[PDB]
Amino acid sequence: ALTYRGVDWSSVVVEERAGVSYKNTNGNAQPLENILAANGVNTVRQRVWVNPADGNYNLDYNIAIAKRAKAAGLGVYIDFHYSDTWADPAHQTMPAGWPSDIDNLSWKLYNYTLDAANKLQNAGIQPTIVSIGNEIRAGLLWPTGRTENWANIARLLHSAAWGIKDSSLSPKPKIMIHLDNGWDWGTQNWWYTNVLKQGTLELSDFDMMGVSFYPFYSSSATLSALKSSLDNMAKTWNKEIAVVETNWPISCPNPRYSFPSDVKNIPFSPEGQTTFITNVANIVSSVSRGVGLFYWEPAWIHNANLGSSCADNTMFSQSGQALSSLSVFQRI
C-alpha cells in the first residue's frame, strides 16, 4: 500500500562509534542498513544540520551513510533542519554565520540548498524526498522566518525549493514541507493557508506534506484526529501525504501525558508497536495520496526514550538486536 516504508536512522554512525553492534532478529551481526532492508524498509530518513560543531549530521556525515543506504537498495529522504542543531516548533536557530535580513538570508538559503543538492548529486546520491525544514510549524530561521512573518516564510521556502529545482540532482527529489502535530487540522490549515496566500511560494513549488505523529505528547493525538486531519489536507491541497515521524513504546512506566483514547488498549511491547505502526500506516493509506510512514530512530538504543517521557521507544534490544516488531515494514 505505502510507497515509502521507512525509518529515520540518522544516529547510525553515532551509535556504531559508541560501540553498538547491530544484529538481525536471529542475533547475527549485520550492518544496520541491511537489517532494515531485510525487514521491509525501503527508505531511510536522515537529518541534515548546517555546521554542527562535532560534525554529527552535517553533509559529509549524511553523504557517508546515504552511500551505505544506497548500497543496501534503500532510498534516501533528506531532512534539512536549516540549523546547526535540532529544529522543531520551539527551536529554529539560525545557522552560525548566516545573515538575518530577509533579502540576504533568502539568497543564503538558496545557495546552501543548491550547494548541498549538487554535492549529493556529485556523490551519486539522489534522494527520493527532501524536506525544506523540519517541523516548521512556527516557521524557520528565526526570527526572520518566525511566525507570523508569513511573507518571509513563503519567500524563504520558495528560495529553498528552487535551490533544489535549480540543482543538478537527477532525478529530482519530491519536495516536502514538514509540520508537527499531524492530528491538529486547525494548525495545519492555519499554516498552509497563511503561507500560500502570500503568492511567493506556489502550490507547484512543493510536492509533499509531511506530518509528525506521536502518541505521548497529548491525548488529542487520536488516530481518528489524524485520519480527519490528513483527509482534510488531502482534499484541500491534493499533495502526497506522509507521516514522517512516529514512535510507539515498548516501555512507558512514567508518561507525562495521557495516551489518546483510541490507542489505550495497545500494549507497550514489540507486539504493541507492530499494531500501532500498522494502524498508522493504514490510516495514511486510507488517505488520498497518502504514501508514506517513517518510524523515528528505531535503533538509537543509547537514547531509548527518544526525547519523550516514555522509557523506551526503540525497536532494538539494548544489545543492538532487532526486535520482532521491525518486521512490520514487510506488512504495510
Ligand SMILES: *[C@@H]1O[C@H](CO)[C@@H](O)[C@H](O)[C@H]1NC(C)=O
Ligand atoms: C550566493 O552565492 C552567490 C554566488 O553564486 C554569491 O554571489 C552571493 O553572495 C551568495 N549569497 C549569499 C547571501 O551568501
